Amino acid sequence: MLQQPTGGYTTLEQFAFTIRNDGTNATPTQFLQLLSYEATENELVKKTIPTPETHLPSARNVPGNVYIEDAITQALFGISAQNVNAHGYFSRLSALALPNTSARLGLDGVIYNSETINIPFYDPAAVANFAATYAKLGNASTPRYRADMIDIYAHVGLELAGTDAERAAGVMPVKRAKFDSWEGSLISLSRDVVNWKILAFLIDLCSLEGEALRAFKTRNRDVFRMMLFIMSTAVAANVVNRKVTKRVDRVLEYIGVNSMRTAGRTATITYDLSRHEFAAKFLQLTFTRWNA
Amino acid sequence: ALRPELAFDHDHIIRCLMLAAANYPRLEGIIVQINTGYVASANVIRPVSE
Amino acid sequence: RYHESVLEIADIFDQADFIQTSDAVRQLRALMPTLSTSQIRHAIERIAQ
């Protein structure tokens, strides 16, 4: 068991989040510098996020080692992820949420039901905290519990596109993102984000408190903004190239507006409706936690 | 849903239409014939005997 | 005392949108015989055929 550092697991260099910038490694923050925004006439007012349902999926015992990290990252960032709403993985997740469970979440992101000493794993109190909320991803599909798939993205815009004045205001113009870019810039960016061990991120988000958690939200704002970026590219109504002085500039329109696009395209990853429900629920929980 | 075909090049088509209009006398008739066919297929009007 | 040379339009203009070709077309035309207009029509009909 890896004891959690006072600043969270993400302080460890083992969990550094990085993305290739036309093939060279870079911090997410230095990618976000590339983005620039042409505002349009429309506005995004952020609605209050409804408080997430208390009901966790039942902690039913299941065969095998469930791979929770790959499941989440694929459902959010992978190219055509499948069976993202299958119940078994989150059944095991809620099993992790029990006060004295035998299950462990390894740094591999796999949930081993054994007390397997050979593989290092996160501190059980921390993952209990983490599953205690994220098991709710299991009710992304159930009609009773579906998150708003439209208004929630307003928040995404603010946390990505939004200037500090716009963020404190809670309202921003709908924006058109753009950056100097390579072929497959958006796809490859997603491929880099998908390899992120976001379990370290979510576990730190759920287990850290007070000054440590605040320092975490400040230190990791750009990371969260990158994941948000990948979602916005999955839902952007249109994504195109603008040649300018022998330099292509990728353009995504629009940030903060879920188009509910489901059909696949070359430019970016795409959400089928099940992926829409999943991501929307994900954002419901994650933003609820982020704004506390 | 993607259609794996090239986009209709609006601009190029209007240019080449203009060049053809400059150089190809038959263009007029070609287009007319298409339109005639539509009318013929719309069955909007037939001659009567009387 | 000069030096005659082809000079591509790209070297003069900064706007790439209106520059389709290069020196190479001029060099190719320099390979061609001067054509009477009927010879041009003949070439076009040939390529078409």
Curated annotation (Swiss-Prot), chain B:
Role this protein plays: Inner capsid protein that self-assembles to form an icosahedral capsid with a T=2 symmetry, which consists of 120 copies of VP2, with channels at each of its five-fold vertices. This capsid constitutes the innermost concentric layer of the viral mature particle.
Residues of the full protein shown: 396 to 445 of 1333
Localization annotation: Virion
Assembly with partners or alone: Homodecamer; each decamer is made up of two conformers of VP2, called VP2A and VP2B. 12 homodecamers assemble to form an icosahedral capsid.
Similarity annotation: Belongs to the turreted BTV-fold inner capsid family.
Protein name (record): Inner capsid protein VP1
Residue ranges crossing the lipid bilayer per the database entry: none
